[model samples]
Target chain A: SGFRKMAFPSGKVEGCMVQVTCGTTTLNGLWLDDVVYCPRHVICTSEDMLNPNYEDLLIRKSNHNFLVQAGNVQLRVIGHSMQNCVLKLKVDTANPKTPKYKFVRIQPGQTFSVLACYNGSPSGVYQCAMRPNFTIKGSFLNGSCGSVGFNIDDCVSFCYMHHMELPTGVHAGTDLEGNFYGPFVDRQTAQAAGTDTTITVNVLAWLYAAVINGDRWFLNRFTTTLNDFNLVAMKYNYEPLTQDHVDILGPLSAQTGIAVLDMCASLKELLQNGMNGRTILGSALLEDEFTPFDVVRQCSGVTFQ
Target chain B: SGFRKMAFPSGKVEGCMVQVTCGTTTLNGLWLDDVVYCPRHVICTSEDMLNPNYEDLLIRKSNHNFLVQAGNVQLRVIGHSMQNCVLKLKVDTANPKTPKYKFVRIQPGQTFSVLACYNGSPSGVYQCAMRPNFTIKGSFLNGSCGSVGFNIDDCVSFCYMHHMELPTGVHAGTDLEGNFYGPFVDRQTAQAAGTDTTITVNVLAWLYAAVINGDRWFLNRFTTTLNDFNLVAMKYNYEPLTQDHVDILGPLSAQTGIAVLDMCASLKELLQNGMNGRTILGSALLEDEFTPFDVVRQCSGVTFQ
Candidate 1:
């Protein structure tokens, strides 16, 4: 028997798609058809799956042949039959006292991309650990997330609005199916590979789309959270408050607040006018109105002052 | 004779100025004459003072009774008789590995205010340490910093422009003299205390005045330094670079660059047009055109994204 392996690149990943081919026998733990599947459970394995369990005892362990990749921003779990696996990502902060951690759940043959740096702090070195026995309580599966997926139209429109160079072989506003091939796998091919890679793709897509679309609710939520954090921080004397600090947290709050309110009113007009409100929302996300405030909020490691 | 003590207040200083009177008995380190005189040396006191010896270890330490006041945003180092004593301030971060330190020098019977949160990081808990033997290095006295100080006219104009309430007992555009009697000390009173006390006051005055008057050069220099720091930070991946980041640093660099350039050009025009260019430059500081960027830059814990 022989094995094949693919390693993730450092810094950037090559798109958000992966492909694997195996002979007649189905690769254990790989998705097939519409149903999820995995190999027989091995109590212990010499080649660690996600997190190896040991009672300080393991005289002999089985060979655990599997394909898995992990990093600070993204993680892919493979070759595990386990359901409801709890995975946690932790980052070491410059401030030893305040480390950061995000916990997520994954079913068999799933890839989860954790949005680091979304907390306004720069993404740093991080590691993923699976819970003991690979199971956890509760689920975010039905959360407001994952409702959105990659829209070919949105992708093309984004590039066009920003005058950004489309990825090689991509033509703005064209049908993704007719144009996307090979090197750039289509959604169908990605599905066929038994990897739910779209989860990672959709997560990023939703964020970009919401930002570009000027989604007032979403943007306001961000500033709202930022201001709340600062309010508490001020009470604790965590940081020195300058006149500028007072300006931003006080008067400037209303500037953005009222502006976003006006945005909502305009959005209401689109709905009241009998136009396709949903479609209008979708189209707006493809426009370019990037600002410094928008960028600062997205940057990692920047906490509220 | 009985001793008198005037402790600093809790919140904002009663006023930015203070006055003290003595009946020609020479109030030790407390300033009395216009020469800014102090003591030759005190053999022993209730509270220990720095520069214990020009030359040793004593079994019984001296008590150097002194009145000092401190606050979160600023701290005043008073009740000292040393001619030129170097003082260092240090702050501990959440992370044990990183710490912040700032050093300055104050003359005998002077008060120096340390500017916290200047680095864009919230001012945290900090401590002050006097250098060994009372001094260590070069003097900032000859530095270009002192060249920029309070122009009473500009200060008054700032209040009028912003419509800010003048501190009680303050008369706009006055000599900061006649009316400033007893409880409220003017610059003359400060100078009489000791040259060092004036140095500290002048330092803080320049900083606040530059802020209140909108001193373009001083403010611009801050952003310039901030950008340079970001340049290095980006290299180490301390902050992620995005289109928004590029839009800000790239476009903003030119925005301020051109504005400052235009400011100079306007000054040149005033010089050519037979206007007092120097005086014109002085008045421009009071003009309101404060940008959100200006407020953002002055904020603590902000980084270039």
Candidate 2:
């Protein structure tokens, strides 16, 4: 569900399609585009005035330029294009205070977060974004070699291991092409801040985990992150959610039995509830064995998942 | 007017903007994107039942894929991004006796057509599309040189010196970043086709010149180019015109004097209509000289142009 926009990550490789024309005849096929390296989360810490546990919370701000000095942060390819390609990551703008492993080589499926741990106190927020600096042959127009690049201003994907809080401005997260989710904590966070909560946090979490942030929590970590969008909403507040929210949630919530499961349930829990025969979360069913992971309604069910 | 979508070939180049982020700080700037080599117009010849001079009329089909072998044609950049970019045009899929000048280097501004002359006789329809194979240093993400490329399917821009009739399917032309304008012929073409023309062809021409087709006639080329889209309109033909067409023409045509001008006249006529204090095509006014080419309508007279 988090990777909804992506076509089944099976058949076609995720890259832009390339085609060329000579005359009335055109030679078209698919080719590799560029790889976008994004260091999603930044682990920044300042002694919490309330709970002094260095309160571990992750920030999902795609625009925050987290500069980790000699820092280790998992930099991943936004799309799976770096699936099997070998890439040489470099420190193009570093002097002495750059990340320790500034120059590194990533090979194959190992492009996922390899876990960069930074537990010490840093002076500022930190993370890294990169460019696709590799050559692809026979993948460009006319069977030749060319280099792929990251476009867009400050283009960066999400990284698993990093820190953050609320962002100042900008709506940037556009996909969950990243595969790292953690610390399903928000209710605890809001209560900790003396701040009352709204269904917005849960609704927003439903969004990021299922659509927006490549790095999202099926739940969430920061309550401020949830409330911040509410400010920018209108004359100061989050906008509204407009999607299958009407068709899907309406009916499910309309029913007394499945309403609870659909209104505030994790997709995993929701699917399990529906497929395993009951929309009752954590309830056992006779259909559990027949279709353990597949979700179906016995007829024309919504498989948009 | 013929190159309106173009951002005045006088300032910052027109290409996709590029920027990269490192940390909390991003190195913001711009670099040259790629040049789309489009063989836009195809001068096809068929014996006109009524009159045949090889009926040298141009067909502006960005997707028709006109194949002209050993054919002399003009290939231009869509956004003028090819301002000073050098490119090596090639026939990637051609074999025995392909295009005569298959391998060529267009240096600097010389990239525009050098007049490829082939007006003898051949069997098939033709024109050519190409790839951008040159490189530029410091234009890439990290001060490195990389080859820019066109990313669309059968991607191409417009060429000046080719030929045409009318395309059979698809809407391809998107802008008028091409600069050469030839004989403004439409009424001559429709009357010749035994086809009682619609104000459509005239109305459509104003479109390509003012918005679409990098290579366009501030006037036009084929009567069929105008009629073909009429078929794809709803039940079977062209769709509706939805743009400033409403705002601009609705008012101009609202008047008897200017209506005749706005309803069937050219943009040159439209601008001159308002600019010269008269919406008449060939009519002149006392204000003509002080602002020969500039368009103005006193105060709040509509400058959407």
Candidate 3:
């Protein structure tokens, strides 16, 4: 006897483990070896592709900048600390002053990602960061937090977030001196310039801006989002950014407190598979001979440097 | 012709996954009886122990000083930052000021290790530190960095590294006060006295040093390489460090931004499997007969405290 394909309605088998069975016979190890097996086939259509709504493909939104699901596209801003904090996500196209973004408050180890439908095929330079709301006492800074951004061709992208706190008694943002940290730009800039060339995004500047504006909510819609790391990953070419890529990039991403290596790997895979790698890799920001590793390395170069 | 073992040498079938071939005799899934698989055998000698050059066992050199093969022995000074910084690895037989050592320059996400053979047997009290050479314009301090060292027996050892950045404008070495952080010699004299009595290898000290150093290249080489992590294993013998041992120590080796858990597990395995368990377990560093986990826990106690 041979095995036949089995079909079950979507959502009917949530959290189900693997099992084997037949009409009236329960298949064991040996019986299964002698039997033929086939798996159910899945087919996708252009209509399905364009509309992009399906079960088992839900991307939830929280008060953080994080993304999930590849069925469509998503983004994530992750928290690397245990403290409660606020995060800000900004997507600027032309005017960096007033960019399109959202503010999310989240706890440590939590993540935030928005549905692609919410952003309508999200693209452009996205910047995100987080900071502590010390007004709610006793929670001193222990880990690092910082802001970072990257250019996404489509829905898939990823970033790692971290932070470094100033010792107590030091006036927040008191040093209005030159930028000491990254993504450095002139004061009063609405949003960080997301171009690849503007690699250095400064958490200190963001902190100063938030404090000066009296928005201790540095837990901003970009509000003084204090030293928060916006850990982002992209499912390049429409593939979902999976956890496997995250594990591989862990070594490189942990230091900066903000990184986007997963997307670079995805983009590299996309390019290798004959997708949009050549064009994107050849962008003015990167050299033509650059590999996927280069994309993440360059992003890290700017974020960490 | 079906080849028994194909050979193409360099870049031949590199970067490829495996696939199986078929005879196409209408082969059913359950045909071969007792299909067997075996592994290759390896024979090592004392000469192999002394020289330690084996096939697929190579030690490459970089501008940094870190370890690679654990064969006979090795030492590593790893960097946890994205900045271009230089580190100095020191091991003192007697004095701290005038010590035996070398310097290394490493970038972010990079590591440096050296062959233990260079030092004949390589054992002494070791220490390391990093500093920033700020010539570039936009670069500034963001993350933490520092130096750390530890004692080891032979080539096996591990250390965790972290950082602390002083307030900008603070004079570089203004607070060169008494033994502030780490290897903090007995509030009286000589280098940690290398005796088994001193238990407080304060992680807090290492963190502070990184912050004060401003260079936060907190890469540590647990020199003194005595009690060096013996980098033991399930090999369950006094056998010198080997690749199999390194594989077992994977869970812990990751940090110097720093880590040590893996070696703990390895030492635990050693205790359980026989080797140095009874003797070391009965020692003063530990007493009352402990498990390998206890050994690691004790090491971590002195390490973190």
Name the lDDT of candidate 3: 0.20
Order by lDDT, highest first: 2, 1, 3
Best by lDDT: 2
- Put down candidate 3 lDDT per residue, A1-305, tens digits, no spaces: 00101111111111111111212211110001112111100111224323333322222223242222212323232321111211122211122122222222232111111111111111001112222221110111211012111112112122222221223311111111112223422122232322121111221222222222232321222211112222221222122333443554454355434344322433233233432212221121111111223323223322110
Q: Write the per-residue lDDT of candidate 2 for residues B140-251, one digit (tens) a residue.
A: 1111111111111112222222222212110111112322122222111431112212223233333322222122223322222223333333222223334443444443
In candidate 1, what are the lDDT values of residues B78-185, reduced to their tens digit? 332322211111112121211122112222212111111111221111111111112111111100010000101101100100000122211111111112111222
| Each candidate's DockQ | 0.01, 0.01, 0.01
Sliding window of 10 residues with minimal summed lDDT for model 1 chain A = A156-165
Worst 10 residues of 3 chain B by lDDT: B1-10
TM-score of each: 0.19, 0.17, 0.15
- Proportion of true contacts reproduced by candidate 1: 0.02
Q: Judge the docking of candidate 1 as incorrect, acceptable, medium or high.
A: incorrect
- Chain A TM-score (model 3): 0.14
Q: Which residue ranges in model 3 land beyond 4 Å of their true spot?
A: A1-100, A105-164, A167-305, B1-266, B269-305
